[PDB]
């Protein structure tokens, strides 16, 4: 992990606005670690399709992911492109369809699945390098401890987590993505409507699962990493909006989560944990800050390069269910 700016930028405590990658111009906000002599372990937060950064960051009922600052974190939050670098967008000009070959316009985080979205088989996007340099520059700044670089985010936030880990699988040292999508593919990468998706992991639900949220086919090796996968249990579901204002189910995140599972869980210097729970599809909301504290000090005590063999999983809090490997509560087992 190297440590620099774009010339001239100047990073600060709170809002960055105007950095320069691949021809955009991002923004940013950073909430130094609090209580933490030395390098701080890092956590990328990333709001969904509704909720603004400010949201994510600050309401309760969203995450409130600064206060992993006053848990030791340097916090570095990125916003979403769509949104114009304002963090108070909330769902205009994100939440729906992306363009240019990208499946959903909050996150650069999944192919598209019409032909346009070819290219982004095996280029990483404009969002996973941008988190990247935006954590290499704020390192410039603030110690930031490389083996522990952690970033994760709640529905196309969650996507994007899947993304940046199957891309990024040598910078960051893991993730929490919760209720992410994968976007089931068919072996030779197909794309696979959401019905058929659903159909193809409850058919194969221990396979491992191509996706269009990341590299095809997906990588045979990634990078050592922590991940922690996180579903909402039965309500987990996303209802999309028509133009006409009508809604219709478009995601469902227990075969996304179960894929995502098998996946990393396979991966033998990857330590995966499965963790379910019954708030839906939207931020943890049981027991959240206490939540949020565990899983990023479950993600911290696995630093990057360390052995799977000697990770030792604590108790979550009340409303969760945890264990390491994949999803076991979702479909039937075979066995059965
Ligand atoms: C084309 C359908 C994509 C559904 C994305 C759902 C994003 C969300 O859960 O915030």
Redesign the pocket.
């Known amino acids: 992990v190297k440590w620099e700016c774009p010339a001239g930028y100047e990073v600060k405590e709170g809002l960055n606005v105007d950095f320069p990658h691949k021809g955009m111009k991002r923004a940013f906000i950073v909430y130094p670690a609090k209580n933490v002599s030395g390098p701080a372990p890092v956590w990328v937060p990333m709001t969904?399709?509704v909720e603004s950064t400010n949201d994510n960051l600050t309401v309760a009922r969203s995450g409130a992911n600064s206060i992993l600052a006053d848990h030791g974190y340097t916090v570095i939050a990125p916003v979403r492109a769509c949104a114009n670098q304002d963090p108070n967008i909330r769902g205009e000009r994100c939440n729906g369809?992306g363009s240019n070959g990208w499946?959903?316009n909050p996150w650069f985080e999944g192919r598209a699945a019409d032909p346009s979205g070819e290219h982004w088989k095996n280029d990483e996007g404009p969002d996973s390098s941008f988190f990247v340099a935006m954590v290499q520059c704020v390192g410039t700044k603030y110690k930031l401890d490389a083996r522990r670089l952690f970033l994760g985010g709640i529905?196309?936030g969650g996507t994007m987590t899947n993304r940046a880990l199957l891309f990024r699988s040598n910078f960051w040292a893991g993730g929490l993505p919760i209720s992410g999508?994968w976007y089931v593919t068919s072996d030779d990468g197909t794309p696979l409507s959401?019905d058929d998706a659903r159909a193809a992991v409850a058919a194969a639900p221990t396979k491992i699962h191509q996706g269009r949220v990341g590299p095809y086919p997906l990588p045979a090796k990634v990078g050592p990493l922590i991940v922690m996968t996180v579903w909402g249990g039965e309500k987990d579901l996303?209802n999309?909006t028509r133009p006409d204002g009508s809604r219709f189910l478009?995601?469902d995140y227990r075969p996304s989560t179960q894929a995502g599972s098998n996946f990393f869980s396979a991966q033998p210097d990857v330590v995966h944990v499965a963790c379910s729970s019954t708030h839906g599809?939207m931020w943890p909301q049981l027991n959240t800050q206490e939540f949020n504290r565990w899983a990023l000090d479950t993600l911290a005590s696995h630093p990057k390069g360390s052995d799977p063999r000697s990770f030792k999983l604590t108790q979550p809090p009340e409303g969760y269910t945890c264990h390491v490997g994949p999803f076991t509560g979702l479909y039937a087992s075979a066995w059965s």
Request: hydrophobic share 35%; proline share 7%.
């Open positions: 969904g399709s369809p499946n959903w529905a196309s999508e959401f996303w999309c478009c995601a599809h």
